[PDB]
């Protein structure tokens, strides 16, 4: 199941003034398959912040809870960088949610809350199908779309998410699925009255409508 997930390794890198990453991995399905994904995602604060080196954010992301038809999702992430072998930011944050989305023409809303602790490497979310519900697709691929903030960064690499606040970040991002299946993903990060606010617009097309995503056969993300 999707309790104790294996770690999934962002590689961080700054690329003409931003904060880019890579990661190439996939979705296990029922049936003991692959469904092999490329994510790539830009991360721009708002205004100039330091940029680190190439670095790596380690991140073991559950689905703890859920009712029966993903409608109520809780879901739960431990991340902190590490480097590659080759006072406006509390110690307690809330978050709050809003992503606006289509897969395949269905049209939904999801609205979440959150909280964690953003020095140690935990944050869990609370998040509601607004509308659209029950989506007609795997929840696995919105998981991720759901928190820069919150990750452990060493005292040596620079903490480019938390440096930009208040103000914040942006950031776009593509998963590229190896059936055609494609997302686009852009996100707002910013800080008001001590809570992070993340708006989120999401648009998924050309899923094979008898693929694993339309058909609900993936079982979380691979190391």
């Known amino acids: 199941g999707r309790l104790g997930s294996p770690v999934v390794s962002e590689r961080m890198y700054p ?93 939904f809303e999801i609205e979440g809350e959150g909280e964690g602790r953003p020095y140690e490497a935990f944050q869990t979310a609370k998040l509601k199908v607004t509308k659209g519900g029950p989506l007609p697709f795997a929840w696995d691929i919105l998981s991720p779309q759901f928190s820069k903030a919150y990750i452990k960064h060493p005292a040596d690499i620079p903490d480019y998410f938390k440096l930009s606040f208040p103000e914040g970040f942006r950031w776009e991002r593509v998963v590229n699925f190896e059936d055609g299946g494609i997302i686009h993903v852009n996100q707002d990060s910013s800080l008001q009255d001590g809570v992070f606010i993340y708006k989120v617009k999401l648009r998924g097309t050309n899923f094979p409508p008898d693929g694993p995503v339309m058909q609900k056969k993936t079982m979380g993300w691979e190391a």
């Open 15 to 107: 690329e003409d003034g931003a904060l880019k990453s890579e990661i190439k991995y996939g979705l296990r399905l029922k049936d003991g398959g692959h469904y092999a994904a490329e994510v790539k995602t830009t991360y721009k604060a708002k205004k100039p912040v330091q940029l680190p080196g190439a670095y790596i954010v380690d991140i073991k992301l559950d689905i703890v809870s859920h009712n029966e038809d993903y409608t109520i999702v809780e879901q739960c992430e431990r991340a902190e960088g590490r480097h590659s072998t080759g006072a406006i930011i509390k110690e307690f944050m809330r978050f709050k949610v809003h992503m606006e989305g289509s897969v395949n023409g269905h049209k």
